[PDB]
Amino acid sequence: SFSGYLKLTDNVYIKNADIVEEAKKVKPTVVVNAANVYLKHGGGVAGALNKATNNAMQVESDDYIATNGPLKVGGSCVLSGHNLAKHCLHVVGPNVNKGEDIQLLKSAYENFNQHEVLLAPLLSAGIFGADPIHSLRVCVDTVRTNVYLAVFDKNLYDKLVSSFL
């Protein structure tokens, strides 16, 4: 099971870890990808998860978009977790660097409530351009299921713990 996490609330846990390395160790039922609407997994968490699957995540994702069209910002889809997890929940948080509405971050975290336990990154933070302190606050105030957050950047992890209310 999950180890070395700091408990933040009744249901939210956090650790300074690379989500690919965590997924390889734990083999969680669900790993969350920080996806975009086209499921083009180029960089950040998505680029890292897809590389760890030897591009199988991108081949599956292209077939999903060909059949279904793009996701909505704030939406999600459940696809295979390949060699990392049973499932991958691809969730699209708003990208502030593309000018998207930060108010959609709560809708994006609501997708997590459809799963009892998840390994996840902070949505909309990192290269998506939003404040990670705000993303952690929306996560705690929105997700009711058990979420294990992997924060890759050590300096960011220390900042998030020290500023958590």
Ligand X SMILES: Cn1cnc2ccc([C@H]3CCC[C@H]3C(=O)O)cc21
Contact residue for ligand X among 12, 35, 121, 143 (CB under 6 A): 121
The total of other beta-carbon atoms located within 10 Å of residue 162's CB is 7
Q: Under the criterion CB under 6 A, does residue 130 sit at the interface with ligand X? A: no
Contact 105, 135 (CB under 8 A): yes
Rounded to whole angstroms, the Cα distance separating 75 from 36 reads 10
Note whether 131 binds ligand X by CB under 6 A.
no
* DSSP string across 46-106: HHHHHHHTTTHHHHHHHHHHHHH-PPPTT-EEEEE-TTT-SEEEEE----GGGT--GGGHH
Using CB under 6 A as the binding rule, the residues of this chain from 66 to 85 that contact ligand X are none
Query: Do residues 119 and 49 make contact, with C-beta atoms less than 8 angstroms apart?
Result: no
Residues 84/72, Cβ–Cβ less than 8 Å: no
By the rule CB under 6 A, 94 interacts with ligand X: no
Nearer to ligand X (CB atom), residue 87 or residue 121: 121
- Residue 14 binds to ligand X (criterion: CB under 6 A): no
Tell me: does residue 151 bind ligand X (CB under 6 A): yes
Under the binding rule (CB under 6 A), the answer on residue 62 touching ligand X is: no
CB of 101 or CB of 153, closer to ligand X: 153
Q: Which stretch binds ligand X (CB under 6 A): 24-32, 42-50, 69-77, 136-144?
A: 42-50
Q: How far is the CB of 27 from ligand X (least distance, A)?
A: 16
Distance CA 17, CA 133 (A): 17
The CA angle 117-123-125, to the nearest 5 degrees, is 145
Largest pairwise CA distance in the chain = 45
57 near ligand X, rule: CB under 6 A = no
Least distance CB 15 / ligand X (angstroms): 10
Least distance to ligand X from the beta carbon of 16, Å?
8
Chain positions contacting ligand X, by CB under 6 A: 18-20, 34, 44-45, 48, 121-122, 125-126, 132, 150-153, 156
